[model samples]
Target chain A: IVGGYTCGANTVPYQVSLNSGYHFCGGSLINSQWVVSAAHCYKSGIQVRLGEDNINVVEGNEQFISASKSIVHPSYNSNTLNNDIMLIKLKSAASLRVASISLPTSCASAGTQCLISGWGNTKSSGTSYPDVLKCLKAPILSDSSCKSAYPGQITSNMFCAGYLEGGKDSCQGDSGGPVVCSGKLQGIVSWGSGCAQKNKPGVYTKVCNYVSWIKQTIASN
Target chain B: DFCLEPPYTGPCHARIIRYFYNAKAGLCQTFVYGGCRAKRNNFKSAEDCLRTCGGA
Candidate 1:
């Protein structure tokens, strides 16, 4: 996140490290054996690391589970970065207390307070990634405002949240983590411009807009 | 602000450092926090906070 701080250890408990030989992205532990992340987060040899704040060391509460499959949204567009969502099926069920969060049923309106936690780039430039998870406070952006911010770049599949003047946002490597509003999973870190860049707020895949697709994907695969 | 009430009851770590944009002060200042739970407006480093909050 742009102006985020190291989150409380118990925070975003659903948060997990998406490791593909090396740590690159984040995910939410939706169930014992399933994780929700971004389509772009996919890579070879992926696994989920749960129950730890720091990625550098294993905590007593942590669990490492390998992912057997990666399911990218059918309409995911890499060039435009739209419909940028994914689900991973683990080889084994998680032993830790899985997060009770779920996909949203309604849209998160503008001005609504939200929280985003991740282990993405800690510096303004992509110079570093932190060992500990970080959380930032943000508000859902109005559709009109978001559209003006990104011009024709905005789409119904995407939603944004951040300061208009630019400060505090998701950066490189944070894709697929939760953008929670009213304690529900409403958005997923999809993509954005430079870390904390102005006008271009952090854009996410509107989870509420993909309910049927997400459900069918989970059940079929 | 952190040095105020409750007096930053969390464990003190001179080495474990982070930075926060002191919005009211319009400057990026260092915070000697423990590992976690050092709450809002705080940031990962001086550079991170300064760059995010429209400061130097």
Candidate 2:
């Protein structure tokens, strides 16, 4: 993430790396058998690496598990980035000391302080993908201002979080990562015009809006 | 007009290299453009994308 620093080992244990030989997107381990991520990052044969702090090296605290199945939100719209959330059922239960994070019990209010973590690009214009997991603190912007920031784009299922003047935000490869508010999964890094640009804060998939959907999907599948 | 559009990878399997203007970042970004139904935001080269949308 732009304007972020490396996270301590196992600090964000719930964070997982969706990989195809290399890390392409991040995910949240919500349960022993399930992971939440962005639908746009969906692909067959993804290896979910849990307990990963560094991507380039094997830190011994990692568990590489295969995804048994991936179900994207039926209402997901790739063109507009609407309903960008997805759920992946793991082939096997997690066997690591790392733990899962709790889903949000309710929607985070405006100006709520939150934390976003990922291994996405640190710079938007060039290759600055970090080997270590990074995180930054950003305040959640209200729905009205989020809409004002991206006319005809932000929806009830999406929210903006970051500075109006830019400098810190999630970038590509950060997709599907978690934005935790009040110690729960509040958002999923979805999209934006650019990374940490002025007036273009990071847009995330509002997890509270899909709590029932997530629970039902897991229950059935 | 092309630069204003978001990067679109149509529902096709082709993975052609292309560039699109990321207006907010004031720079061009490379993407894998699918073979069909690509929007006007697509550019054949990075230079074309910068030339059209860089100074915005």
Candidate 3:
């Protein structure tokens, strides 16, 4: 959310905020009954708020739903942040003005411009979780660049976006959010070295790598 | 540079998550500290580590 701007209402209608009492993680509505988020944000009693733009305002377009179940990737690694994607099953189908974002059919090539949207902490120094959602404009870095930046930490399941000289990137509370490229859900905000730090681009779960798992998980469950 | 220090796990057995600047790689990374006696490069989060020594 660092160096980002307020997202217009319904511009990112697929974005959802995961909350216990306060907004903690961001998610994408993949389907009416399912949501895609990050595994690290897993917690009990999650309330999924869909079609929300400004969290503080009572936008009638918002739909509050409970998560009946959450399934994390079986091979998710917390230490290295590998396979960080998760799926949340809504107690009921979402029927708001919101829409589901399509999963990626193919991976976004390096240098592909993308959007990272969320209600995450906007300030790089301290907490500044905004009332309205924000979005950052960044480009997917080459795997070589990402690996060089993170070293031994950027797996094939992950990718990095943002500038090497810093100034734009996702921060805390944006985890589990969408990284949309070419109008598809290309990535999930997972981790980063720091908010908009030099050579420390934001890392995300590469969605194309898990499309099969997502389909299978949703179908069998 | 103080941020160039490698991550120190300490002699304790605690597996607390901390961040340290890896001066060799020129970026900050998460490390598991032993919860006590961490060196100067240690930070509570990556932002703190980068803020102190990101470009150093």
Candidate 4:
């Protein structure tokens, strides 16, 4: 799962490194200190690199910070997989030089056009993790259309994005990544059965609903 | 009105007997019937129930 194109610096994607050489998923630097990612990617031995392009070499003098604590949403459930958001507290606050992404207060009303970046597998259903970071553009879908696409499975707490076609999407290592729209962080890459299926769009955790939770968690710390 | 015992019944026993009597008379129908009965029971003021049934 470690072989793909280098995302590069101009893309503005965050990188998470696990194990020693293995890098999985991209994150968004939401603040001077915290990085927003999916809860599934919040594991031990994880280091987040901000303002970096390449995942393999760890070059370019990027802001590297160790995770102080992994705070997954308290109500997050892995079985039904609802509320898949997590906040990573950096051991040391990052400098303001690293670009920080803004979080959207209201996603549903924020229009459809959004951008998502990751280093996931190119194919829909493949075990290969992308070695270099890559990004793809997807649109935020209406709730009704999204529900119809997934049928009986889509919840209001979740957001959907992807094209009706069969290619160009975030998959595999893209989990716990950023789905930004209109200069605001709209969603977090949670789960999708496949990379880019006919009807299934990449589902994400709606960032707007947890604004209070995020603020409270950050203020308390 | 089936009173024939010599020893007066306790308050608990009297309360049970009164409950049955009220239920038969459709006064306590909220517990028996569903939504409709509950609505009717609500309309009957607490004061009226207390006055008519010697306190609910």
Candidate 5:
């Protein structure tokens, strides 16, 4: 997370690490065995890490669990980043203390304050990403303005946020991470042309648009 | 994600971690890195290969 500060231990207990073998993207625990993440993160050896603060160390809260099932939206399009969302069913539920967060009741309005936490790059690029969890604040961008920024690329299933001046924003490793607005999971970090670029804020998968799908998937699975 | 760096120069362990870059799959999948006899595409961790080679 560019221009973010180190998060306190277990401050965001709901945040977890999605690792194929390394901490790549961030995810939120929405149910005992369900983790919603970015569809672009789909891959084999998908494992979720819970109760972890420092990526380098395996603390007590740090539990590596295999994924029993993984589902990406059938409509997901890598070219357009459409429906860039996914859900992982853990072989077992997260720890009792590894609580899950709630989805948004409604869409967050423009300029709504939201929080993004991840183990992404602190700078523009490279492996210099942090070993500890990092977090920062950003606001939701209005739909029209966001569309203006991305042109025809912004879909109803997506939303935009971050500063036009580009001081802080989510980066490469932040994908599938949560965007909490008013204490609700409103978005998931999906994509951006560049890291903290001016006039090109980070784009996220809107959670509100797929609430029914999430509910159905959970029930059916 | 990225292409794995080969040769497990690091000490072998009961649980050897080995990652490989699956060109067809487009992600650096994981495996157990036995001391040697592996190809150059082998990596210590997903992070190491992710940095060396960008993700799909």
Candidate 6:
């Protein structure tokens, strides 16, 4: 409830849908034109739901927008999944109510903590995706500590989070989501090889590095 | 004393005379003479030259 914003009784934020029917993770509205999410969550014919909670209950007040275009960073190579970020261009702009949840810029700095929510599996080898979205709190670690934790795996383009002893973390179906810290959008819920494994931190795409690219790409449209 | 008599006069002789006259007239005060053209002993090649130079 720390980062939660109430719309009526429910927390209204951004959600991502992969393939045709699979609701993967949650994201945040950064601008009227863009929603920040992980690049690995991007698939052909993806849809983004704004101003809603329940994915199944999409009809009432929820705004559904078809991703008209997807811009994944050119540097994003899935080998190590370095630079795992993407910008979704909605088919049309969302109304003002949805835009109000946009993330601020200050979230990009160091020591900023954020919230991540997803319908991912509760456990690493858990059988099924969660019925409801579960939220988790993650504190941003320094780049040096993050690299040391992964040991030659982490890159500068990536930011790390999750507990060191490894209990709560974002898992599968949580790929493209927002990591909001300090009322600002910091990272996109990208991939990690496993869920909170020993010496492996949850990796997210650093939001600040791609801010200019995001602005220029959105301006072209 | 053997006077180095002028070689057979042709267009070549006229060219040298022109150079001399221009030098005397101050049109060409600093003249550095390079070697003259190779002597045309045979008439066949000279005959070709005469065809183009005849009008001159």
Top-DockQ candidate index: 2
Residues B1-56 of candidate 4 have per-residue lDDT tens digits of 31111122110000001112143443432111100111222223334544444323
Q: Give the range where candidate 5 chain B is weakest over 10 consecutive residues by summed lDDT.
A: B7-16
Ranking by TM-score: 2, 3, 5, 1, 4, 6
Model 1 stretches with alpha carbons more than 4 Å out: B1-56
lDDT of 2 by residue, A1-221 (tens): 88988888889989999987677789999999999998877877899999998889997888999999999999987677778888999999997447899988899999999989998879856657788899999999989999999899778898999999988988867888999998999999877776788998988889999999999999999
Model 1 DockQ (Cα-based): 0.02
| Number of residue pairs clashing in candidate 1, backbone atoms closer than 3 angstroms, sequence gap of 3 or more or interchain | 2
In the range B1-56, model 1's lDDT, one tens digit per residue, is: 43221212121111224566665576777643332234555666667665666542
**What is the iRMSD in Å for candidate 1?**
14.3
Quantify all predictions' global Cα lDDT against the true fold: 0.74, 0.84, 0.84, 0.60, 0.79, 0.57
lDDT of 6 by residue, A1-221 (tens): 11222223134355444434556445556666567666655557767777655556555766778878888778877556677777778788887535434444543654666777665556754434554456777788788878887678777778888767776676655666667676566677765545666666677877767777777877886
Q: What DockQ values do the models have? A: 0.02, 0.08, 0.04, 0.01, 0.05, 0.00
Q: Candidate 6 docking: what grade?
A: incorrect
Q: What TM-score would you give candidate 1 relative to the actual structure?
A: 0.77
How many angstroms is residue A115 displaced in model 2 relative to the true structure, after the best TM-score fit?
0.8
lDDT of 1 by residue, A1-221 (tens): 66789887757789888875556678887777788888777666887888868788866778888999999888887666778888999888887534647777788889989889887776655456788889998999999988887788778988889887777888766777888888789888876666687787888888898888777777887
**Cα lDDT, model 5, residue A195:** 70
After TM-score superposition, what is the CA distance of residue A129 in candidate 4 from its true location, in Å?
4.0
Comparison by DockQ, 2 against 3, better one = 2
Structural similarity to truth (TM-score) of each candidate: 0.77, 0.82, 0.80, 0.71, 0.80, 0.69
- Clashing residue pairs, candidate 2? none
Could you give me the TM-score of model 2 versus the true structure?
0.82
Considering only N, C-alpha and C atoms within 3 Å, which residue pairs clash in candidate 4? Answer: A1-A128, A1-A129, A3-A131, A124-A195
Candidate 3's TM-score:
0.80
Instruction: Give each prediction's root-mean-square deviation over alpha carbons.
Output: 12.9, 7.0, 9.1, 20.9, 8.8, 31.5
Candidate 4 Cα lDDT to native: 0.60
- Deviation of model 1 at A71, angstroms: 0.6
